[PDB]
Amino acid sequence: EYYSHPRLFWLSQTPFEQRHIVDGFSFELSKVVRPYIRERVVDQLAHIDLTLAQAVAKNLGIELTDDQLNITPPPDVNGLKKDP
Amino acid sequence: SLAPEDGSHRPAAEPTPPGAQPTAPGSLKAPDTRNEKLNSLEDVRKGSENYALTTNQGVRIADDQNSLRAGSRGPTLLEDFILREKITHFDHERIPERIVHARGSAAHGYFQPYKSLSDITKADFLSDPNKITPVFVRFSTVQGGAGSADTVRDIRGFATKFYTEEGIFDLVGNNTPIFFIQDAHKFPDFVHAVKPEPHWAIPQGQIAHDTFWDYVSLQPETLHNVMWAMSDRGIPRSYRTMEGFGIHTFRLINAEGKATFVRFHWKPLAGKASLVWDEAQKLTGRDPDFHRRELWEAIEAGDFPEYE
Amino acid sequence: SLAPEDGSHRPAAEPTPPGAQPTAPGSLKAPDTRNEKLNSLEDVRKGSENYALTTNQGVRIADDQNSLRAGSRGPTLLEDFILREKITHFDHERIPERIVHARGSAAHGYFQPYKSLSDITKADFLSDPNKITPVFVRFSTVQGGAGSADTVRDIRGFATKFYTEEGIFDLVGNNTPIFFIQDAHKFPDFVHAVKPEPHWAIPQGQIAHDTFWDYVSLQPETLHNVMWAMSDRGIPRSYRTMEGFGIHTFRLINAEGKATFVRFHWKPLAGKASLVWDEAQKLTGRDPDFHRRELWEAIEAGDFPEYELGFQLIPEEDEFKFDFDLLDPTKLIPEELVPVQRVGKMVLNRNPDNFFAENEQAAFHPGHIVPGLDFTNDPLLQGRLFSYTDTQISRLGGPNFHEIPINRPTCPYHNFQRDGMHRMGIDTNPANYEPNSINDNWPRETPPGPKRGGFESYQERVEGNKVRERSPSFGEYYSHPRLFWLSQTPFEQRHIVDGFSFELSKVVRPYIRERVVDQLAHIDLTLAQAVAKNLGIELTDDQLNITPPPDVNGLKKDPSLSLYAIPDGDVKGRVVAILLNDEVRSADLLAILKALKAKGVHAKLLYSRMGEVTADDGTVLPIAATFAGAPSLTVDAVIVPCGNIADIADNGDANYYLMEAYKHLKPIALAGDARKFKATIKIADQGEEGIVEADSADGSFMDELLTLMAAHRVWSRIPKIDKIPA
Amino acid sequence: SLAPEDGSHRPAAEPTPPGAQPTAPGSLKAPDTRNEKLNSLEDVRKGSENYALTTNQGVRIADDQNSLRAGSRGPTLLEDFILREKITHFDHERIPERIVHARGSAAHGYFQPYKSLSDITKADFLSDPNKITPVFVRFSTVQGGAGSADTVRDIRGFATKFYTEEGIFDLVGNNTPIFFIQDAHKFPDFVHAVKPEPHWAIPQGQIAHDTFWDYVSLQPETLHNVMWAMSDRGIPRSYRTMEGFGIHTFRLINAEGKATFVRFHWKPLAGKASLVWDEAQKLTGRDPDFHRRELWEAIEAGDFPEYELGFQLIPEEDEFKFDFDLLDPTKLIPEELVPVQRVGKMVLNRNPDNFFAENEQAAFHPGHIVPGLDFTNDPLLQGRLFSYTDTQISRLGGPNFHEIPINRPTCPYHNFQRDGMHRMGIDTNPANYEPNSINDNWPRETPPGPKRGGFESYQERVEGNKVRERSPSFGEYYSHPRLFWLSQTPFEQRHIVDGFSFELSKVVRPYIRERVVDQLAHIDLTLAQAVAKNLGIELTDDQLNITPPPDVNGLKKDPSLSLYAIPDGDVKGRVVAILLNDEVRSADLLAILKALKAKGVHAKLLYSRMGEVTADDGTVLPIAATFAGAPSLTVDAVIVPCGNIADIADNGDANYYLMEAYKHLKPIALAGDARKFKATIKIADQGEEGIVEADSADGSFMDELLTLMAAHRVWSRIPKIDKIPA
Amino acid sequence: ISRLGGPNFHEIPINRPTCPYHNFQRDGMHRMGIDTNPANYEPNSINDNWPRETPPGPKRGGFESYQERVEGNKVRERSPSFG
Numbered sequence A: 001e002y003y004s005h006p007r008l009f010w011l012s013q014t015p016f017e018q019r020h021i022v023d024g025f026s027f028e029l030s031k032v033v034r035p036y037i038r039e040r041v042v043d044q045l046a047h048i049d050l051t052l053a054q055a056v057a058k059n060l061g062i063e064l065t066d067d068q069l070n071i072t073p074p075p076d077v078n079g080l081k082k083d084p
Numbered sequence B: 001s002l003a004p005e006d007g008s009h010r011p012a013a014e015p016t017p018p019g020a021q022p023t024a025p026g027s028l029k030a031p032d033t034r035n036e037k038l039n040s041l042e043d044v045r046k047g048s049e050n051y052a053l054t055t056n057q058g059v060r061i062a063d064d065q066n067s068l069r070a071g072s073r074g075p076t077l078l079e080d081f082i083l084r085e086k087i088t089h090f091d092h093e094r095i096p097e098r099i100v101h102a103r104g105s106a107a108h109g110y111f112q113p114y115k116s117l118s119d120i121t122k123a124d125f126l127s128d129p130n131k132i133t134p135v136f137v138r139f140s141t142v143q144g145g146a147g148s149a150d151t152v153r154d155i156r157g158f159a160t161k162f163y164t165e166e167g168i169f170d171l172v173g174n175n176t177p178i179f180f181i182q183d184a185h186k187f188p189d190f191v192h193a194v195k196p197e198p199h200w201a202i203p204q205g206q207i208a209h210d211t212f213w214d215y216v217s218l219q220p221e222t223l224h225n226v227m228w229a230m231s232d233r234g235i236p237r238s239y240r241t242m243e244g245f246g247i248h249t250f251r252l253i254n255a256e257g258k259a260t261f262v263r264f265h266w267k268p269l270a271g272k273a274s275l276v277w278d279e280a281q282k283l284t285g286r287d288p289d290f291h292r293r294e295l296w297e298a299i300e301a302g303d304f305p306e307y308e
Numbered sequence C, D: 001s002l003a004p005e006d007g008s009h010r011p012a013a014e015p016t017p018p019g020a021q022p023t024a025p026g027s028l029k030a031p032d033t034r035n036e037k038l039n040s041l042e043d044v045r046k047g048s049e050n051y052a053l054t055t056n057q058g059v060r061i062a063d064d065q066n067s068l069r070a071g072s073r074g075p076t077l078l079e080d081f082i083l084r085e086k087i088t089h090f091d092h093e094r095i096p097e098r099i100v101h102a103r104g105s106a107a108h109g110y111f112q113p114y115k116s117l118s119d120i121t122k123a124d125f126l127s128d129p130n131k132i133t134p135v136f137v138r139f140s141t142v143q144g145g146a147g148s149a150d151t152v153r154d155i156r157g158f159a160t161k162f163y164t165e166e167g168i169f170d171l172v173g174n175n176t177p178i179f180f181i182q183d184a185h186k187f188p189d190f191v192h193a194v195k196p197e198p199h200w201a202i203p204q205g206q207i208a209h210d211t212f213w214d215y216v217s218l219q220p221e222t223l224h225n226v227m228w229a230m231s232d233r234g235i236p237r238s239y240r241t242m243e244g245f246g247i248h249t250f251r252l253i254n255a256e257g258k259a260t261f262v263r264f265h266w267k268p269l270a271g272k273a274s275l276v277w278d279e280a281q282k283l284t285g286r287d288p289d290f291h292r293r294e295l296w297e298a299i300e301a302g303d304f305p306e307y308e309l310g311f312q313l314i315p316e317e318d319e320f321k322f323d324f325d326l327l328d329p330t331k332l333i334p335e336e337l338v339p340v341q342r343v344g345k346m347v348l349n350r351n352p353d354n355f356f357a358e359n360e361q362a363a364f365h366p367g368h369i370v371p372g373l374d375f376t377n378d379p380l381l382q383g384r385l386f387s388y389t390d391t392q393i394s395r396l397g398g399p400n401f402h403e404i405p406i407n408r409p410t411c412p413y414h415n416f417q418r419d420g421m422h423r424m425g426i427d428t429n430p431a432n433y434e435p436n437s438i439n440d441n442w443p444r445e446t447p448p449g450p451k452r453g454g455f456e457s458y459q460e461r462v463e464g465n466k467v468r469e470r471s472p473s474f475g476e477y478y479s480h481p482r483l484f485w486l487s488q489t490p491f492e493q494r495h496i497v498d499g500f501s502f503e504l505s506k507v508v509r510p511y512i513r514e515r516v517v518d519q520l521a522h523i524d525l526t527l528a529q530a531v532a533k534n535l536g537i538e539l540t541d542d543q544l545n546i547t548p549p550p551d552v553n554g555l556k557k558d559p560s561l562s563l564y565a566i567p568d569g570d571v572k573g574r575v576v577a578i579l580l581n582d583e584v585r586s587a588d589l590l591a592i593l594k595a596l597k598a599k600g601v602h603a604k605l606l607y608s609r610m611g612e613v614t615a616d617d618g619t620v621l622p623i624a625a626t627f628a629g630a631p632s633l634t635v636d637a638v639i640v641p642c643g644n645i646a647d648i649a650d651n652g653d654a655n656y657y658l659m660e661a662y663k664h665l666k667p668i669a670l671a672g673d674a675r676k677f678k679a680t681i682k683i684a685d686q687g688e689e690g691i692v693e694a695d696s697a698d699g700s701f702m703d704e705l706l707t708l709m710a711a712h713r714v715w716s717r718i719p720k721i722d723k724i725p726a
Numbered sequence E: 001i002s003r004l005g006g007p008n009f010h011e012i013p014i015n016r017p018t019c020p021y022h023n024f025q026r027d028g029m030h031r032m033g034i035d036t037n038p039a040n041y042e043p044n045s046i047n048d049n050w051p052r053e054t055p056p057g058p059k060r061g062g063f064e065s066y067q068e069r070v071e072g073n074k075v076r077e078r079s080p081s082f083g
C-alpha cells in the first residue's frame, strides 16, 4: 500500500508548505527530458491527492484525464486525516 | 619567525561568535571541553609547536624547499629519500569516499538519559540519568560526492556513535521517518537511479533527473519519502534545525527478556527550520559549505547542537 | 514492456542540438564514429538489449525485487547469494579520487599533423600528415573533489593521451602557461595550502581562504600563476574556449640526435572566452555540471571541440638568451620573442560509454613519452615523473593499471614483467627474465634509430655537486606577473583587481591581506592601490616607492597574454535564450531561428511553465525550460520576440532574466513591444550599444545581434552595471 | 645470449614422459588441446617471439641492462621512467595468499555426464551426455602457505569450476567425506588452532603441535576427520590417487520442483594410493613440489587425471531415517547404506600458461550454484556461503574478480552492477537500475522453469525460534570415528596408531596427549591402548571400561572407507627408478623398457654421476639424475638390471636407494648379478614376496614386478622393516 | 604501499620511531595520528611555521647530503671498471 502515507503527509502540511511541495515537484519534473516520465509521475500524484496532481500538472502543461480525475483517494491512516 | 608580532594569527581559546576569530582544531579552540572518548584520543593527538620538521622515520629535515639535484640546475637524484617520502605520502592521501552519504560534517559531544529505562531495556547507557555517554555524530546528504554542496534538495543522514560501557551502539538514521524502498535487495537500483547517470556522471547533488523520476514512477513504494524530499524537509536551514529518525522498528529488551518494539527519534531543541528552494539552490553556489560551516561555527560560539 | 509505445525514451542516433534529445552513451549516440582506440575497446563493451539479468557468475535471476527470507515477513537468509553479490558489488563501487584534478570531463577524438616534422623530431605520431593518432582528453579543475562544481575560479587541467604506434604519449598540461611553484618538493605544501583546510575541510572548489593566501604571501614565486588565476582566465566559459600549455620546456630529438627545446601549446579553434565572476559563482549553484554538460552536448551536436597543437621552439644554443631561465616553470616564453609554430589538429568527436570505466579510471602521466621526445631539468617536471606512476598504485589498485581498457596502448607491448593485483595478460613466454636462452632472448631490446627504435635519453651534460639548492636564475618573481598585467585590456585589469579584492575579503586574518598587498606593490603600483582601496588598506610611503620590476627582454606587453585584446570570437555552438509569451509574433521567431541556424548558434525557448504556447499564426511552440529553470547564466545572449508582451511584462522572473543577463554583459535583443523591457534595465529611449532593438526581428536585427555575440560580451557596459539591483 | 643451434632449449609440442623434455606453458606444449574456456582466454594470452621489449606503455627499450645515471659511475636519475616502471611492477607482484588452501596446483579439462539426469535435476550441465562442460580444477593442502610443501600430513582440497551454459558452478570439496567442525562460527577457532602458532609462526604445513591437539581434545566433534587425517589418507601419493567429496548434503531440484538430497563424490580412475609417513616427511625436503610436479608431468605425458563424479541420493522423505543427522558435516553417509550413483567423467588435459594469472588468481566458491542445484541448512555450508565472496574482496583487490580471465563465465552475463576497482566491462546500457523504462527494462528477469530459467530457491519449510544452538542430533562424536577405524585393514590401522603416536609425541604439554588418549578410549580400546603404549601412558580402569559407541545403522564396517581393502590398482603413469652401471646388459634394459611401455609406466635412468654411460651393445644411455638427486621417495618401484654390477656394488648411495625403497614397502626387482644387492636388504636365498629376482629380466620377471606395482606397496614386508637401519 | 596497505606504515607499532616525528604530511589509509597543527603546509604563518627545518650541525641537526661532485653525460651505461 503506497498512497495513504503520502496523503497523510500532504494533508498535515500548512497551505504554504503545500505550495512548496507543488513547486518542488513542478521544478523537478521540468528537468526530466523524457515527457512520458513526467506524465507517469503525475499519474501517481493523482493517486495521492487530486489538488496536488492538478497543481503540478498545470505547471507542466499536462491535463488530467477523466480517469485520473476519478481515482478514489486512499484511506485515512487509522482514522487520522492529519497529524500536525 | 613568520607569525604576526601582535599574535593575531591564533584564535582565542574561548567561545566566540561566527566570524569573530579564525576557526581552529577543536582541542585548540576548546581544550577544556572533555569527555571520556576525547580524552582516550590523547594517545594519538600530535602537536607541532616547537618541534623540528622530520621525515616519518624521525630524521630532521634541513631544507624543505628543494629536491636533491646534481648542480643547482641539474636533474633530481633518485637518492632523494626526503622528497620521495613526502611525495609518496601525498600521492596516497585519498581513500574511497562513502558509497552513499559521502558528504558529511561531524562533531563530538555527549548523551545523558532523563531517567533509568531499566523497566523497558537493559542497555547500560540508558540505565541511569548520571550515565554520560560520549557520542560522535556525522550529519550528511545522500547522493553527492564528498566535494558536493551542502544546501542541495536531498535526504539528510544523522548518524550517532554512542561509546557505551558495553560496546559501541551506532544509531544510523536520516532526517525523515521513512525510506524510499522496502527491501535491501533494491538499494543498488534505487541508489543508481538517484546518483549521477552513468554515461556522463551528471548531475551532482541533484535528484532532478530522468533516471530518478523513472524509478519513482515505476516503484510507487517511493512516493512517501519522495513527498518528504519535495517538501522543505529536503532543504534544511541547518543540521541543528531538522529532525532525526531511526526509521526501522527495532526492539528494546529488558532484564526479564521482554521485547518492546521501538522507533527512534531525535527532536532538535533549536526547533525545525528549512530554507526555500531558490535560496537553497543559490546557496550551493554562494557557499557550498554552508551547513558544514554553520555547524562548526555554532559549536565554536557555544550554540551547541542539542537534540532530545 | 516499460518503454513508451512511441519510442520517445530512446535518443536519436544522429547529431542533435543541446536539449533536443536525452543524452546517451557515445557508442549508442554516434555508432558510426570510429577510430583505432574506440575499435580496440570493442572486446570489453557490453550491451544489454534482449539479454537476461544475471549474477556476475552468469546465473539468471528470477526475482530481482526481493531478498530470500524465511516467510514473506521473515528474516533474510545468509544463503541469499544473489542479494549478497549485488550488495557486495555496490558496497565496493568507489575508488580513491585523484589527489588533484579529481573533477574532470573527458572525450575521445583524433589528432593529425599538418606536415611531417621529421627534421626536428623522430616521434612517429608527427612523421606523416596522413598518420592519424587516436586521443583521449580529460579536462579538469585542480582543487575540488570529483563531486565539486565546474565553474569555479581555479586553474584547469588539459590532459591528452595519444595512442601512438610507438607508445602512449601523455601530454599533461594546464590552461595557463606557468605553474605556481618551482620545485616538486613543494607540491604537497602548495596543494595542502589551496585544498580545504585540514581541521574542518572547508572550502570546496575555492582558493579564497586563509591558508592559500598565507602560502602565496610567503612564496612570491607563486604570484605569476596567481595573476592568471585572478584574471578571467580562472573562469573559462567552456573547455572549448580556453588555451592549453605543457608549461615545461621539453625536448624534441630528431633522427640525427639533435635536441631542440620545446614548449607545447593548444590553441582553441572556437577562440578564447571566459565568464565573469558573479556569473561563474552563481552558476556553481544553478548548474554545478555546466562545463561537463557543455562538452558532452557540443559533441552530441557535432560542435566538436577542436584545438591546434603548437610548439615554441628554441635551439639548444639559445638556452641562455633570455632574461629568465627556460627550466623555470613560473616563467612563460612570450610569443613576441618565440612564436608558436602550428603542428597539427585535434578533434574530440565521441563521448565515452561509461564515465567511471573510461574517465574516472584513465591514468595520464607526463613521464609517458615516446622516442623523439625527452625531458629537461625543470625541477617541477623532474618530480612529476616520480608522482604519476606512484599515485596510480593506490588509485587504480596496483601495477597493472595499463591493462584497464582505456589505458591500454593500441601498439604492441611485451616484456618480462609479471603478476600484480588483477593481472589480465596471460604470458606464455617460457622466460620471465632477460637475458634468456630458453626463449632465444625474446622479447628483445631494440637499438635507437630513426624510426621504430628503442628509447635512449639525450646525453645531456650534467655537472655540479649533489645539492638541495634553488638555482639563483629562478629567484626573480615580479617581472612576469608585470608583463601579464600590462598585457591585459583595461576591463581585464578591472576584473583582476576585483578578483584579488573579493578573494582577500574572504581571508580572516587581516595581516595576510596586507602581506599580499605588499607583494602586489612589487608588481604594479596601480594594481596594488586599487586592491588596497577595496580592502581599506593604505599603502605606506615605502610601498609607494618600490621600483617596478624590469620588462622581459625589452617587452612592455604581449597581447597574446590577453583573452580579448585580439578578437578571435566564434559563435558556432553558443546558445541563445528566447523568452516566449502566450501569443508570440511568429515572423519574429522564424527570422530569429533562421538566422541562428545559419551560424550554428543554438536556442532555447523559455516560458513561465512547461508545455507549449501557440503563436499568432497558430504555430505550436514547445517550451524547453521555465525562466527560473534555465537561467541567463547558462546562455550567451537573450532575445525577446514581440507578441503579447503584457503576458510576461510584470513577470518577476522574466524581468530578472534580462537583469542578470545585462549585469553579466551579455548581448540582449528586443523586438517591437518587447522593447518595453528597456525600463527594467534602464536603457535610454534612444538605446545603447549592446542592446539590439527594432520594430521587428529582420535583417538587420539578427546581424547586429550575431555581431555582438562574436565579440562575446559587452565590455563597454561595465560602468553601467553597478546601478542595477541584480 | 641465445638459444643453442640444435633447438634443445625448446620442448617438443607432443606428449612426452616425465623428464624427457623441459616442462612448458600448456598452450605451447599442447596447442591443439582446446575447449570453450581455453579458447575464450585467447584475448588475454600474450606471446613473445619476434617482439620488441617494451615498457607497459608500448615504448621500445634500447638498453634493459642499465639505469640512467649522470656519468657511468654517477647517481641514478629520477627521470629514469623505464627503471621505475619495471621496479614498480616488480615491487607490487604479490597479492595476499588464500586464508586456507594457500598451497595448490591446478589444471584445465572437461566434464561430461554419462546420461541425462533430467529426472532428478534440471541443471543444464548434467542434461545431455554429449554436451561437454569445460572445467578448471585446483587441488590443495589446507594449513600451509603458498610456498609450503606438498606431501605434508593434512587434508587436501579438490575444487572444480564448471563453466556451464547457465552459469559457473564451483564444487569446492576436500579429499575426506567429512569436516572437523559442525558450525561455521567455529571455523576461525579451528583454523587458528591448526595454523602456525601466533607467537612464533611455527609449525608450517603440520598439525603436530599443541594448539591443534588442544582444540581437538576439547571439541570431540573433530575426532572423525582427525581419524582420516591420521590414516594414510593424510599423505596421498598424488592428487590423481585420492577421493574427492563435497562433504555437505546439497539439493538437486528437477523440472517438476522435486528436491532430492545429494552428496557429491569424485572417484579417481587411477585408483586410491597413499605414501607412508617416513616417505612423505622426507619427501617434503627432497622435493617440496612433488605433487605439483607429478600432476603437471602426468598431463604433459598424456596420463590425464580422470575422475568419476558420483552422487549419493536420499529422497526428501528419508531425511531422518539414519542414526546421524544428514545436515551434520562431521558425519559421513556410508556407501553400504546409500550407494554412489555414477554420474559422469572429468578429464584434466591441459596445464595453465601462467601459474599466477590462472592458478593463484582463480576464485572458487561453493555458493556459485546454478538452477537445478540448491543448499541445505548444514550450519557449516551456511557460513561458507558468506565467506567465499567476502575474502575475494581483499585477496583479489575488489568486487570485479569475476572479470579476471580465469574466473570469467563463458556464458552470457549482464546486470546493473557498475564500477569497482579495475573495472574491465564498459557498459553501454543507458540504465544502471531496474525497473527502468529508458532501456525497456533490459537486461530482464527470467521466470524459473525447466531449462534456461531464472534461479528460485526451493521453498523449504522453516519453523523455529531465532537461536544460537547446536542441534541435539549433532551431539554424537564417536560412532563414525569407530566405523572408520573398523573399516581399515590391519596395516592401515597400524599406520593410524603410528600417526597419532608420532603426532602426540610432538605435543609439549603432556596433559593434552593424555586428554587425546581419553578421547580415543571412547572410540576403540585397542586403538587407545596402542597409542597409549607408544606415549608411556597407561589407561585407567575407568578408561578400560568405557562402552564403545553404537554401530552406524547396524554397520560394523564399510570397506569403501579403506584405501586398499578392495584392489583398484592402475599402474599407468607410475614411475620406476632403473639403477644403471657403466656396462648395462642391454638385453635386460630392452625387456624392462618394453614391458613398462606396454603398461604406460615411466622410467628414470639413474647413475652415480650425470652425462652418459654406454651399454654392452654400444647403446648410449643418458642419465636423468644421480642416485642422491632423484631418491627412491620419488618413484613407485626400483629395478636393477645386470651388467658390470661391480661398478655400483659398494656405492653407498646405490645401496641406500634400495634400503629406503625397501623400508617404504616398494617393489624391487634385481636381474642377474644385481641379485648381490639382496644382502643389503637381508633377503634369504629363497627370496621374498615383494622382491622380484631372476637370471635375466624376461617376460615373466616384468609381469611379476608389474603385478606388485598394481598392488601399490608390499604390506606383508611391514614386520621386516623395523630391523633395517634406514 | 601495497604490502602494508598505504603510506602510513610508519604508524604500525613495530615500525614507529621512538624519537619525535612531526611534519606536514596528512591522511592516507589507516591514518592513526590526529594532527592538531592549524597548518598542513610550510612556509606558514598561522602556526608560526612549526614544525621548523633545522640546520645541519654536529648533533641534533637536519639531514644534508654530502656535496659529492657529479660530472658526466646522462647515460644508461655500465662503468668499464665493473667489467
Ligand code: HDD
Binding pocket: B087, B091, C098, C099, C100, C101, C104, C138, C139, C140, C156, C157, C158, C159, C172, C173, C174, C178, C179, C183, C184, C187, C246, C247, C248, C329, C362, C363, C364, C380, C381, C383, C384, C387, C388, C389, C391, C392
Ligand atoms: C609532484 C607532484 C606533482 C606536481 C609537481 C604536479 N602534478 Fe599534476 N598531478 C599529480 C602530481 C603532480 C598526480 C598526483 O600524480 C596526479 C593526480 C592523480 C594522478 O593520476 O596524477 C596529477 C594530476 C594532474 C592532471 C589530471 C590528469 C587527469 O586528468 O587524470 C593534470 C592535467 C595535471 N596533473 C597537470 C599538471 C601540470 C600542468 C603541472 C605543472 C606544470 C603539474 N600537474 C604539477
Ligand code: HDD
Binding pocket: D098, D099, D100, D101, D104, D138, D139, D140, D156, D157, D158, D159, D172, D173, D174, D178, D179, D183, D184, D187, D246, D247, D248, D329, D362, D363, D364, D380, D383, D384, D387, D388, D389, D391, D392
Ligand atoms: C566460513 C569459513 C569457511 C569454512 C567453514 C570452510 N571454508 Fe573453505 N575456504 C574458505 C572459507 C571456509 C575461504 C576463506 O573463503 C577460502 C580461502 C580463500 C578463498 O578463496 O576461499 C577457502 C578455500 C577452500 C578451498 C580452496 C579452493 C581453491 O583452490 O582456491 C577448498 C577446496 C575449500 N575451501 C573446501 C572447504 C570444504 C570442503 C569445507 C567444509 C566441509 C570448507 N572449505 C569450510
